Amino acid sequence: GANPYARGPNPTAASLEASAGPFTVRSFTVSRPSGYGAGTVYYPTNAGGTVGAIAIVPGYTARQSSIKWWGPRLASHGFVVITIDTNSTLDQPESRSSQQMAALRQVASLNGESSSPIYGKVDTARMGVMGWSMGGGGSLISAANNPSLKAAAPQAPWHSSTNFSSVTVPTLIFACENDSIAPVASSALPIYDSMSQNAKQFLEICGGSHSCANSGNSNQALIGKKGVAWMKRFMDNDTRYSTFACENPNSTAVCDFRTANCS
């Protein structure tokens, strides 16, 4: 019958393009980070049920600031979101993936800690991974190693290998057309093309620098719609979001769009 994981009102373009979803958001600093440098947890105060958890990792040299805007944007649509700082700003993708999974583990721990603001708010069986550049490569390694993850949505990803043919997790890749750090043609697009077994999507922002999906970007309506739609469709099995998740947004800001096995 009814999808037990469906949360919130039926979506519209307007509701997904808005700065905030329907739920009220609060946040806290993780008091004793377990396996990573630091974290901020964003959560809805008024979802009508337990929600999935998403862990988000920055790029090389970067901090939570670069990725922070996802915390409220996703949590306001019914997710617990942890943004991390890595143990070192100079950690590489494999380390970033371990730390991302350690952050998801700690959100699972906090869900069982009666003093935590997220006590009983998380469905620890439903998790997703996001991140920028080496933190995006780390997200893809997390998905490859942990195929029970329900969705991945890295941005301007990079890894030392572009072969993610093992990934069976639904994966949306955000890319930035004018990326000079991890050029689309040598990084994000090969990574996308490698993935044969999954629902997948490629969305490249016109004229975007390497930071085109970071906090402060000028395309939050489109990028936030797609990220929330992908996570709703695949972490919540919420087919109300199937068309938003799978469609070509046919948008001025989109300079490359691909998708496969999307429903």
CATH of the domain at 245: 3.40.50.1820
Per-residue CA distances from 222 to 83, 136, 217 (Å): 21, 19, 11
Sheet holding 200-205, edge to edge: 25-29, 38-44, 80-85, 51-57, 122-131, 151-152, 171-176, 200-205, 254-260
Q: Report whether 230 belongs to an annotated binding site.
A: no
Taking the CA atoms of residue 9, residue 11, residue 15 and residue 20 in that order, the dihedral angle to the nearest 10 degrees is: 60
The reply to whether 1 falls in a domain is no
Catalytic position from the list 85, 91, 123, 179: 179
Q: Solved by what technique?
A: X-ray
What is the Cα–Cα distance from 44 to 25, expressed in whole angstroms? 5
State how far the Cα of 98 lies from the Cα of 83, in Å rounded to an integer: 14
Catalytic residue, chosen from 133, 139, 187, 211, is 133
Residue 6 within any structural domain of the chain? no
Question: Regarding beta strands 171-176 and 51-57, do their DSSP bridges make them parallel or antiparallel, or are they unpaired?
Answer: unpaired
229: left (phi over 0), alpha (psi -120 to 50) or beta: alpha
What total of structural domains would you count in the chain? 1
Q: Would 8 be classed as within a structural domain?
A: no
Q: Note whether residue 100 is domain-resident.
A: yes
Q: What is the CA radius of gyration of the chain?
A: 16
* 3-class state of residue 257 by DSSP: strand
CA distance 257 to 82: 28
The alpha carbon dihedral of 232, 18, 226, 10 has a sign of positive
Tokens encoding 117 = 């603001």
Q: Is 179 a catalytic residue?
A: yes
User: Is 134 labelled a binding residue?
Assistant: yes
Catalytic residue status for 210: yes
In a domain, 145, yes or no: yes
Is residue 5 assigned to a domain? no
| 195 part of a folded domain | yes
Spot the catalytic one: 91, 139, 210, 236. 210
Structure tokens at 37: 């440098």
Half-sphere exposure of 40 (CA within 13 A, CB side): 19
State the amino acid at position 54 in one-letter form.
I
219 located within any domain: yes
Other Cβ atoms less than 10 A from the Cβ of 35: the count is 14
DSSP per residue over 149-176, as a string? --EE--BS---S----TT--S-EEEEEE
Give the distance, in angstroms, between the CA of residue 121 and the centroid of all CA atoms in the same chain: 19
Residue 192: phi, psi to the nearest 5?
-60, -50
| Active site (annotated) includes residue 159 | no
Domain that holds residue 89: 13-260
Residue with tokens 């037990």: 4
Q: Is the Cβ–Cβ distance between 144 and 164 less than 8 Å?
A: yes
Is 60 annotated as contributing to ligand binding?
yes
Rounded CA gap, 76 and 74, in Å? 5
